């Protein structure tokens, strides 16, 4: 009695403090974690939508390059490999076996005359 | 010793508190381990999606290449060509032909 009731009071004080603190962690975390789990779900999709377009633009670039490089070359009317023999307008061949194969089909169109 | 029992009760309470905080920070850590796993499996599916769209677009690339091989193209402006000059050299019209002549002159193999 005296010292004992004084230190009981100290234990009551300490326990009451721990309750206040835990009431603050609990009141704050239900809200704070609500905002952290949607903040990271959105930053992921903003990064993904910037990625799909990054590659669409890239391939659209590579396409136009490939198409333009194709404009600078003659191509075999038979097999679409690059050609080196000329027959008539818009008709070339990689070699005479392609020309000789294509000839039944090409004869109806050949303008070499 | 009543006094001693109380102060011990105090130390055992504060030790329970450290266990408390350590339980929290271990859940804090398991939330992050599951969190970072999320972006990983999501990025994995995202990259498998990207793969299929690359596949589609390379198919279109090859289709445009193949269509381009079936036509003559202006050596000057890459519009479709109409007038023939010589091997691999064709023009959409006389302006292009003559605009190109200063350079093409040395390569013209006109027969
Ligand atoms: Zn061929
Ligand atoms: Zn022909
Ligand atoms: Zn032109
Ligand atoms: Zn020429």
UniProtKB/Swiss-Prot annotation, chain B:
Intracellular or extracellular location(s): Nucleus; Chromosome; Cytoplasm
Induction description: Induced by all-trans-retinoic acid (ATRA) (at protein level).
Annotated consequence of substituting residue 101 to R: Found in two patients with syndromic intellectual disability; uncertain significance; disrupts interaction with GATAD2A
Positions contributing to Zn(2+) 3 binding: 74, 77, 92, 96
Span of zinc fingers (MYND-type): 74-108
Annotated residues for binding of Zn(2+) 4: 85-86, 104, 108
Region of interest (Required for recruitment to DNA damage sites and for interaction with the NuRD complex, CHD4, HDAC1, HDAC2 and KDM1A), residue spans: 74-108
Coiled coil: none
Tissue expression: Expressed in neurons (at protein level). Absent in astrocytes (at protein level). Expressed in all tissues examined with highest expression in brain, lung, pancreas, and placenta. Expressed in cutaneous T-cell lymphomas (CTCL).
Connected disease: Mutations in ZMYND8 may be the cause of syndromic intellectual disability with variable cardiovascular, ophthalmologic and minor skeletal anomalies.
Subunit description: Monomer and homodimer. Interacts with NuRD subcomplexes containing GATAD2A. Interacts with the histone deacetylase NuRD complex subunit CHD4; the interaction is direct, appears to occur with monomeric ZMYND8, and is increased following DNA damage. Interacts (via N-terminus) with the P-TEFb complex subunit CCNT1 (via central region); the interaction is direct and the association appears to occur between homodimeric ZMYND8 and the activated form of the P-TEFb complex. Interacts (via N-terminus) with DBN1 (via ADF-H domain); the interaction leads to sequestering of ZMYND8 in the cytoplasm.
Domain notes for this protein: The bromo domain is required for interaction with histone H4K16ac. The PWWP domain is required for interaction with histone H3.1K36me2.
Function: Chromatin reader that recognizes dual histone modifications such as histone H3.1 dimethylated at 'Lys-36' and histone H4 acetylated at 'Lys-16' (H3.1K36me2-H4K16ac) and histone H3 methylated at 'Lys-4' and histone H4 acetylated at 'Lys-14' (H3K4me1-H3K14ac). May act as a transcriptional corepressor for KDM5D by recognizing the dual histone signature H3K4me1-H3K14ac. May also act as a transcriptional corepressor for KDM5C and EZH2.
Protein name: MYND-type zinc finger-containing chromatin reader ZMYND8
Native species: Homo sapiens (Human)
Lineage: Eukaryota, Metazoa, Chordata, Craniata, Vertebrata
Gene of this entry: ZMYND8
Parent sequence residues shown: 955 to 1065 of 1186
């Amino acid at each position: 009695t005296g010292s004992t009731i004084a230190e009981i009071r100290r234990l009551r004080i300490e326990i009451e403090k721990l309750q206040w603190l835990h009431q603050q962690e609990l009141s704050e975390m239900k809200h704070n974690l609500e905002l952290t789990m949607a903040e990271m779900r959105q930053s992921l999709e903003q990064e993904r939508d910037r990625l799909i377009a990054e590659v669409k633009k890239q391939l659209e670039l590579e396409k136009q390059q490939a198409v333009d490089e194709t404009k600078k070359k003659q191509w075999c009317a038979n097999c679409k490999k690059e050609a080196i023999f000329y027959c008539c307008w818009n008709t070339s061949y990689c070699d005479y076996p392609c020309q000789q194969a294509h000839w039944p089909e090409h004869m109806k169109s050949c303008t070499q005359s």
